[PDB]
Amino acid sequence: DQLTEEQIAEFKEAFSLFDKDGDGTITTKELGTVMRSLGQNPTEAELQDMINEVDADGNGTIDFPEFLTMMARKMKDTDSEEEIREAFRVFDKDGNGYISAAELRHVMTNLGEKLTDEEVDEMIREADIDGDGQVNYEEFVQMMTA
Amino acid sequence: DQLTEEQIAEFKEAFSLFDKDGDGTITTKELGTVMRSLGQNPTEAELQDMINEVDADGNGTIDFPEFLTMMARKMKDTDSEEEIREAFRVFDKDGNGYISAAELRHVMTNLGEKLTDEEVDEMIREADIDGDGQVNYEEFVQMMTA
Amino acid sequence: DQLTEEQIAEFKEAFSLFDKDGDGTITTKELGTVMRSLGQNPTEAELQDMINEVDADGNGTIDFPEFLTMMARKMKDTDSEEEIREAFRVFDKDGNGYISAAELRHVMTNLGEKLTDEEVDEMIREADIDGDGQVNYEEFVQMMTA
Amino acid sequence: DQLTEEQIAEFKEAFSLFDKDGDGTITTKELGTVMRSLGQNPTEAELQDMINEVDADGNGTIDFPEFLTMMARKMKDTDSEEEIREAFRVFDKDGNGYISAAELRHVMTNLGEKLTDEEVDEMIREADIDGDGQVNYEEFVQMMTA
Amino acid sequence: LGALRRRKRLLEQEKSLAGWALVLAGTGIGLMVLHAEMLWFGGCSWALYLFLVKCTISISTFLLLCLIVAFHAKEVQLFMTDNGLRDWRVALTGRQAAQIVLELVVCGLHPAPVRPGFLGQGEALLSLAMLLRLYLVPRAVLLRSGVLLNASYRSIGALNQVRFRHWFVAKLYMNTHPGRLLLGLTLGLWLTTAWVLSVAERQAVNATGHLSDTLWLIPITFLTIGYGDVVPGTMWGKIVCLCTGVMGVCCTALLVAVVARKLEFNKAEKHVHNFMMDIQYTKEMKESAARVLQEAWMFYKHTRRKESHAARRHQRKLLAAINAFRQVRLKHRKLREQVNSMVDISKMHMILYDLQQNLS
Amino acid sequence: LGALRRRKRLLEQEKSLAGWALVLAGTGIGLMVLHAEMLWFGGCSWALYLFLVKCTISISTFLLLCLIVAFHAKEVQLFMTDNGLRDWRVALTGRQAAQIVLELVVCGLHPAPVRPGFLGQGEALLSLAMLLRLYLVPRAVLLRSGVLLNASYRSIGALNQVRFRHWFVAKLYMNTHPGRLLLGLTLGLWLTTAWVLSVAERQAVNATGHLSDTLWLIPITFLTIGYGDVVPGTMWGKIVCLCTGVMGVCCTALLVAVVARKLEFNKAEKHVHNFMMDIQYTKEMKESAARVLQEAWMFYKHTRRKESHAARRHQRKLLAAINAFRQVRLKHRKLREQVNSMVDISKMHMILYDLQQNLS
Amino acid sequence: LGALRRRKRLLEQEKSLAGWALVLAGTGIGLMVLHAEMLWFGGCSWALYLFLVKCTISISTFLLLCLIVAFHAKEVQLFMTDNGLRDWRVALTGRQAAQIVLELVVCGLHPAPVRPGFLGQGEALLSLAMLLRLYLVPRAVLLRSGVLLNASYRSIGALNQVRFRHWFVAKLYMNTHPGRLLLGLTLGLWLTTAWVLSVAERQAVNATGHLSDTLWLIPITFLTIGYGDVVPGTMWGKIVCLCTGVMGVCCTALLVAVVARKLEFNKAEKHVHNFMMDIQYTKEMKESAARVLQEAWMFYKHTRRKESHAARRHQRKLLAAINAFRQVRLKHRKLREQVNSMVDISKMHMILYDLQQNLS
Amino acid sequence: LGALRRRKRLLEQEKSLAGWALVLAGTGIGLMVLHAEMLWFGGCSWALYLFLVKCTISISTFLLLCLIVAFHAKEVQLFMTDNGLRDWRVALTGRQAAQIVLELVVCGLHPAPVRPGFLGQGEALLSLAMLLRLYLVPRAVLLRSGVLLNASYRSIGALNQVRFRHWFVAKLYMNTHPGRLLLGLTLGLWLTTAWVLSVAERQAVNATGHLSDTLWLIPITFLTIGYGDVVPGTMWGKIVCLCTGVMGVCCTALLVAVVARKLEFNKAEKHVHNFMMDIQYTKEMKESAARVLQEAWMFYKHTRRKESHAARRHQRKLLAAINAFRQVRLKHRKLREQVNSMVDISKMHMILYDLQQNLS
Ligand SMILES: O=C1Nc2c(ccc(Cl)c2Cl)/C1=N\O
Ligand SMILES: [Ca+2]
Ligand SMILES: [Ca+2]
Ligand SMILES: [Ca+2]
Ligand SMILES: [Ca+2]
Ligand SMILES: [Ca+2]
Ligand SMILES: [Ca+2]
Ligand SMILES: [Ca+2]
Ligand SMILES: [Ca+2]
Ligand SMILES: [K+]
Ligand SMILES: [K+]
Fold it and tell me: What result follows from mutating residue 249 to A (chains E, F, G, H)?
């Protein structure tokens, strides 16, 4: 690892705040009680979403290798991933993890500078890598990242 | 319709606040949750009365043709229908949708300038178009409008 | 009655505040809801005591003849009956409607100017009209009224 | 007893605040309701611990001979027993009424001036009068009192 | 039940006497300014009109000295009826006798008609001691308010255990309309003091102090904006200014408190304000997101054609559109906490659900 | 449904006729300061240039009167449309005629061109009476703001009975920018009063009351820091200063309240502050306990090895380590109680338990 | 259990050894004002009297030091008894020596009798340095008040960890009667400073500063109404005036807040006020509805039988009646809404229902 | 994960480059003050030493400009590292160039050494324009405090969206030590303004505006106790006095608010006070009841013995005791209601019962 010893110690100390039980993993109850202490009252679905948006292996728990990566992003001020994923829910009137043609049409051809039906269709075709009508989050992120 | 396009658009946008589900009709739950957001805690009977005082067809739901008529009255400042219907409940000690002779007698021959029994009887006879002792809201509104 | 018409009308109007149902009698529920409106939260035993301390016939309800007598006492500022009945509960460590010798002995021979056992016994004998050890409220009130 | 009459009377009057029922002993309910009046909301385990830390006979109740001893300690300002027993719970990560070698090692060889493994082992051996690895509260208090 | 009659009759009688014992005091105070000012703008020319007034201000006091005694007799006669006594030697304590004697001597100080234009030392104090007759106002106002006679108002007050005195009526009048009382009191204290300060610094040789200068001096001291153009020059004029300053320091704060309190919102418009701000934010976010996405697409399409500066411009615009979107999102998220915590909404729904569960 | 069409035309007509009746008032007020300054710094040398300016302010007032009458001729037609009447003799009430006459009289005072540099009493009073045309600002601001015409505001307010008026809009503007309004008003008044005070006490022989001294006098009186270097010297200059002081007393309090409010913590930062202070206190306690124990161990060792001064030093250090530990523990306990009572963790847990019980 | 007896005996001894050290300090302070004023109003004809007065203030200082040392010895002995030690060389810390030395030095400055009416710099500074012996008041007040020796205060406070100190006693003495303390402090500070400012700038011939002018200067500076008639002339009076101004600015607001708080309603009177306003509004609403419903029939029966002017009058009065009814209805609805969420007429019912559900 | 390491090294570099840009500004300000004082208290004698102090402030300014230019490169590098860009031409926004130019031209004004004790106008403004370099303090205090580098603050705040900035640190510093900051700010502003006011007006022929009078004038204006002994005499001193008054009006209010807040009770002592007051009222009632009963018994005794005066005295004492009992009873009832409200043991029991019902 490129990090020094002091940084590793600081990150381990920060992790120990959430992993108070000492098991070595973070579960829903610990995050829930930390949020309760902070003042919020999260729901089960919200806790599950916030604990699943970070883990990569999929075991349902978060450990240090999957926590250092998350901590590497919250330190910087000007984020460019949360503000991209939060421009996805606004457009997402479908209710699923996809964007339909009508949503893009009535959100873009009207708001701001009015677009055209041909331009909207071209954008939908370009975004639809697989050719399906719906647009997944992967194609969305790829299109905006370029 | 004598209204222009902009007025129709504004009224439709105002309607969309209450008809958030998009069904095209307003039910008890939507009005109840709007009132909850505003701060009040209405009861079922109050919600039913406030949702039935406007509809004319009687289907139990309120749509745009029965909403524009209601909106045509709340804009003006000096109302002359709410203040007339609220002069009906004060006299209405009967408990039903009617006014008896004794109520009018003891509320009018005493309050303000004292009236007379003959005058009260003449007024009751004039109001009673059907000749019945009780006075309905229709004859009440007709007498006040003249 | 020695009262004039205006006083009778005022007292009837005051009574109508408590007898809102129009039955002609005051029950526990009406007094309870008036006290709820005023801010207090009385209990069933307290309501029963406050509604039984006034009635004389014993039917469990209070009407105008038993209400005018009560109203004749709350108007004056310097009471001499409530302050006498509230000097009864303080001494009453027995728990019943009677005063024992030990209570009087340890409340009077110690507090204020110390009394004597002979004086306490003489006072108890004088108060005990029936000769029983306990002292009822009637003898207490009679002794203090003299 | 070396105390005078006035001090005994004052302590009895202080005791009567807690023993309101007059039984002659203090139980959990009376202390609980006094704490409720003061503003706190103690739990059953906390009440049991606070009522068992004082009694010596073990009958589960506290009377005057076991109350005067407790009152002889709360009067002085600079305590040296509560601050000694509260330096026991901080080290006590075992969860039982004992101190293990690892707890002392990682709490003392690191905090403040760093100690040594040999010094920690010597201290543990000196504290362990019975020779067992764990250290009881008796040996702890004895070591600090010296 | 003759008590309920012998109390009303006595209360009405003593109300009439207490109302008629104020006109005489007002006339007595009034017939002193017309004597002092006449003696100032006059002298030996008016030698009989300075005797007629000083003889009238004794006839106007010999009746007050009897009205007070009559009122204090009726109060004892009412107390006897209240307690059901028979002998009047029991109902009189020592404190009441002290109060009666103090009132008799306080309401009996006036310039005695037992007689170059100056109020000689000795009677100026007596004249200025006739301003102590203002303790009769509360006694003549409480008996006339009418809350001591309602039958529907002494039982609601009895249940809650409240007693009616000179303070409850004062609180009621203060809280019915606080601005009027302050605006009518600060314009009375600025004028009943400008004459007391004038009588203590009248100068004959020149206009060192009079009503032309005190009317300018008093408000300046009251507002603590003391300039220094005119200053008092007598031991008796250097205490009135201190009293005025002490009163003003409190009056100004009492006024500014009400002025600040008036401008605040009530509980029936803040909810509407929050609702209509939420409606605006929920469309500002939609406005910003579309610009972000279309700028991204423009950048992609221009860089697909090997452009040089178009891609740079589009990227630079994107990096600010993102910031604007972030700011708007943060504002909306902050406001949602207030609209879901201040008006409760969820708490009201939970209370309704608990009530429904208790019912069934 | 014809009312909804015939109201939004009359309201726009009223908005135009009320926005075009303020430009003429502004021009009329402007063409008076110029005339006064020209007469002061000029004299009898310029007469045609004064007769032109004193004649323009009649042409610029006839139009204002006509516009006022025209605007007041629309609130009767609006009332007729609202109530469905047919004869205009019924719509007009008693008070409206008095209001119209008062408005015509107030908006019709100006120096009449019916004619050594000075202003006479009548002309000066008429000129200073043209500052009463500032009551038109609220009427021309309420109509222009788009709050009486939205189809959403009037629908939401019906359920809560707000009845949008002047006061609601004024409160909204006050609460949107609390600081800017005060910082603008306190500068507008300081300059619009320094000229009214200048015109009252201009001096010809020597410059003793011109605009170069009132600009220093007015803020000093406003801040109640009255020095005494310059004081007003006329009956009409002794009232403006009092008005300025009265306004300043309230303005200072209104400003300091907002300034104090701006620095307070919100509800989303005290929680973080407490959650970090708790960790700090726990670390401090764990640090102090170790020293408390090691000092006792050193004392026991040096006592076993037959030493005196070392034992004394260890005793003295132990008796202070205990005190430090006690202080830290007492500090920690109160913050733990606040955490258990401020953020209401127990209350949130109880609410969640009640919700779960209601669900099951 | 001899520890309790020893503690009580030592505390009783300290209660007197710290009460007899205040009389000597008071006498030493008193015998300096007399000496200074006798030297001012006297001269060279009071040599032996001045010597006697300056020797008495040195005799009455050799006992204060002994009392202080005895009190500190008793405190050390009490600490030894509390901790159960045996050698006094351990109880003393590293700061008690500094405290004792500082107290001995501070309580040991006086005009030394080691000797045209004036005080030299050294003697004036020493005399004005004897006003620092006022730090003994809290120490002699805390011990005398019976809160430390009570057997119930310490038992109740153990369950809450109050740790009675100077601040708790001061808080109780302030909360028992805030007004008396404020008036006493103000009247003491207006007089104990008027003598220091007098001695700072006494003038020999044509006295520009004395007790006749400082008594007027000090309150004016205290109230921030600085006129400018008299101003300090030396460098040692300006500091005193600044201190007085700071103290006044800090002290006025306490009295302001107390007076503002005194006038508020109680929790047992607002409910009665609302419960009677309800009846009043109901009566008014019914009264207005009666007129509204008579006028319509009046208009109808005057219109059916021909006639025009009577119909016009009735129609015009109908609208005013409707307007009045609307105003009264809105006021009553607002009052009911305020009552619903202030006295919580339904919260008590909900709590009772929850208790009943829990019981059953 | 080299981004974290790069950010750490850059944030450590730009802390030293921001802490070394304040020493130079302090040195420049000090040299300017020394040069001004030497010019005033000198002249042609110090004709050479005014060419060295006037030359060092050019080297210091050049070094400061170099450091300011160097600092803004690291921030751009930090932005590039955060966003992962490769070309620096994209990370420069329009506003940042204006910020850099303004910071270059504000920190570059000084007396240019391009050259009788009177500071000629034209460079006095330049010498007084070097007090604008105090905007560097926050930028060198925020970076030095270790809150931006802690690995726990940035993790806790992410769950609450605090976004640590200048304002958060300022609020934390204000809340930690609210007392010392006010004293420090007041004692700094009472001295950094007394020199500007001295340089603004400094008479040469007669010393009438030097530092011996401004130190007395500034606090008087600050406290709004303007006497009038000394007043400013130029157009550049009046603005300074107005600014001082404006600052003082807010500072005094803040200090008074803090002092008033300090003395209030906490939540852990009011309960003890209420409990110990109830324990005493419940004894006062018992004390009074016994006297009532024994007086009644004595009155009943002295009535069968044909005694009159004894019976009258006993009757009066009975009435007095009955009167005295009522006040204590009412006070006890009110205190019982108060202790049953807002600290309700009934509410605590209801919460416990609800928790028990939820559990079972
Ligand atoms: O202060 C206390 N009073 C107590 C305690 C514990 C038990 C009992 Cl019974 C009493 Cl009266 C206490 N804490 O240990
Ligand atoms: Ca875990
Ligand atoms: Ca994982
Ligand atoms: Ca719907
Ligand atoms: Ca329908
Ligand atoms: Ca009934
Ligand atoms: Ca009955
Ligand atoms: Ca017991
Ligand atoms: Ca036991
Ligand atoms: K002045
Ligand atoms: K002032």
Answer: Loss of sensitivity to triarylmethanes
